[model samples]
Target: KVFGRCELAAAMKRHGLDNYRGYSLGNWVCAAKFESNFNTQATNRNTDGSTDYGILQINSRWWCNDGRTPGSRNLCNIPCSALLSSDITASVNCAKKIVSDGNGMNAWVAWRNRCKGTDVQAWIRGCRL
Candidate 1:
């Protein structure tokens, strides 16, 4: 597991993600909540035969290799295990690149389902970012 919301906000702030690519801290936090429950070791297999990795639940098809999946681009050149670390720097860097590639946070389905068009203030309420 990674950390609670406030702690995550603190880390995000420390990592300069409070305002990365115009995406708000709340959006990032909200996405993390629904995607991995803030767990760094999180992994979930999807119906499309893809697996999501880490707190952001990045997919195996394009982002990282789980070492068992086929047709993996591994554009991030990272192992899925890399995302399972308590140190979130690698995951955050990959996630930032994903967001920067014109997809924004919409690359995560969890974000669209839960955080989209919603008030995200509470995600960072006590974090004081």
Candidate 2:
């Protein structure tokens, strides 16, 4: 709950997430706004009984393990609860890995559904970023 757009942008930059690959910080902010509004503890359950974790909403399907999903491959090698923290390192690392290999941010439904092809500049409006 401590994150507004500008604050989040600064924090992300400090954490080295401002720009990775070709993904702009604006798009990243847009994704975060739609996904979890920058709430560290945010979580949502899917109709498929899967769970999304933290601001980036990293899924439990093949990423982190929540101990709620059996047979989870835990490809991220992290506990789902680890994503739900004030520290965003775990979530950022996982997201970077996910966006690699040409996947981009399509893994995040919010990005495809809302942020894609949009005027993402609004996400960082008036920010010194």
Candidate 3:
């Protein structure tokens, strides 16, 4: 599913992403916009034989097991396919684990290049939540 900006903001907050690991709701929203344009089914294959999955673009190399990435840690203990669901719970939870594992939100290159050090409030300014 592709989400509206505010819808994704509220959903991320609902899943406890608001200030999770010191990154704000807008940070996650902005990262999602740049990463997947809020699409749940998004996937990107990396040159390193790894794949990124879903809205937050969690990596198959370290987070989810796709059974194709070599030496996958599967730290999230979930199938990479789980990140493609419209519910987004799996993606959010896996993202939290990514942040909690000490990578912080910088784990997402899109976040670093597009969202980081930017005034992210505009990303959700009109949202009621």
Candidate 4:
């Protein structure tokens, strides 16, 4: 029903802030897992005339307003399908932009620090979130 958490963590390590450790990757992975269960083919209800997609939780209404594109969840809100392709590596390099750009991934940062010491997989253990 979903991608592996370790795999997601690996992806985060690739794209997370270069200057910083991969602590945020833990947070982002959980958030994305909770949001879509790592389902790259994930989509949600149009809460405000906008649909979001991917682990990054991109909004379709904002990027691909082609009106012809099926509301299928594909990558970020960019609407440029294939961005989250398995071969594309969304979690590592591709996924970083979503966190950077001064967007402030405070929640993710906090999440990272919370699980930093318990070891990668062990940290995920018993983590209700």
Q: What's the lDDT for all of these models? A: 0.86, 0.86, 0.92, 0.49
Residue-level lDDT tens digits of model 2 in 19-112? 6878888888899999999888999998778899998999998899988886676888999999998888898888888888477989888999
Query: What lDDT does candidate 2 reach at residue 100?
Result: 84
TM-score of each: 0.93, 0.93, 0.97, 0.56
Q: Provide the lDDT at 113 for model 4.
A: 47
Clashing residue pairs found in predicted model 3: none
lDDT score for residue 102 of model 1: 83
lDDT of 3 by residue, 1-129 (tens): 999999999999999999998888999999999999999999999999999999988899899999999887899999999999989899999898888876688889989999999999899899989
Candidate 1: C-alpha RMSD to true structure equals 1.2
Backbone atom clashes (below 3 Å) for every candidate: 0, 0, 0, 4
Quote the lDDT for 69 in model 3.
96
**What is the lDDT for 118 in model 2?**
99
What's the TM for model 3? Answer: 0.97
* Per-model RMSD to reference: 1.2, 1.2, 0.8, 6.7
Could you say which candidate leads in lDDT?
A: 3
Better of 1 and 3 by lDDT: 3
What are the per-residue Cα lDDT tens digits for candidate 4 across 1-129? 256776656555554433343444455665666556677766664656565555554555434342544654433444445434554354344345545545445434333444334343552554433
Q: Is candidate 2 or candidate 3 better by TM-score?
A: 3
Q: Highest TM-score among the candidates is held by which one? A: 3
Worst 10 residues of 4 by lDDT: 107-116
Tens-digit per-residue lDDT, 27-121, candidate 1: 88999899999999999998778789888898988998887777677888898889888888878989888988887888988888899899987
